[PDB]
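Priority: low. Protein: Casein kinase II subunit alpha. Input follows.
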Amino acid sequence: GPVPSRARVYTDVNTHRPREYWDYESHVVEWGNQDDYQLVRKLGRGKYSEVFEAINITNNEKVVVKILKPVKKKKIKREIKILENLRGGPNIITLADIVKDPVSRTPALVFEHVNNTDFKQLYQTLTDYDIRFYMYEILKALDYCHSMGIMHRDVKPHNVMIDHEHRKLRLIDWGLAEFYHPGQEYNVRVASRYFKGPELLVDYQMYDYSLDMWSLGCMLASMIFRKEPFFHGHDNYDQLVRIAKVLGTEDLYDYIDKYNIELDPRFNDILGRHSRKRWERFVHSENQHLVSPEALDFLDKLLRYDHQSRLTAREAMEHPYFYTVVK
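Result:
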């Protein structure tokens, strides 16, 4: 069977917590007043909810309302407890209220409003400096939630709200987030395809915070190379092959060999043999101004097969890539 794995940081944070902190199943929701909020515009619809721009008539503040669908239930308490545990943290979206929607008859989460601009349009205009600046801001959020014993598990541009005018950033949609418990096996059906870590793609369940750092790496690669997405799989199997065509197959086998993992035999015919590529390969006249030796070294230390070898969020904040960012 597979070799066990543990996070190299924040390993035991939850074990030293009162049960209440992580025992989300027992959490008692404190309900607010649904009539405080008036829905204004439907923004979108997720797999697990519909999202509205709304107004808090008890102060005329714009808010965001996520009305939860009859989900996996108990997943409701998980997201609520995590939001409450993380509230006030650096660049963590603020849960302002929890009300019972009268029509859906499900909980509706009320969030602070953020005047974001579509990541596509925004990732077209970011300067080198701005990439570094916002990466650092995302790292603050990630080190915070990791330090609080929580992994986000859905890091992607769609879940980073950026108000470019005021240069503020929020990490949102904690619906897939989980408490990290050493030795616990987790569902590998998390994150979005292009941002899935190798551990998910090879069905290794005993993963940790370092999943988020692979995802962050995928974001970084897409930004500095102007390639969206960087690893463009057609499905979850092709996703790993796309990764292997860059990181090489030898280090992939070293990885699965370390954890005594067996690849799905359907990879026999599609994986092939691939050398590790130098990152310079992806540099060209159109993205060169976004690339530096520091950027490439930083990316290289995020995008590692072995989840145990990736930079942690705090280590990432130490990297020379961020020396130019005003703190």
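Residues 128-147 form the longest helix (20 residues). The chain is about 30% helix and 15% strand.
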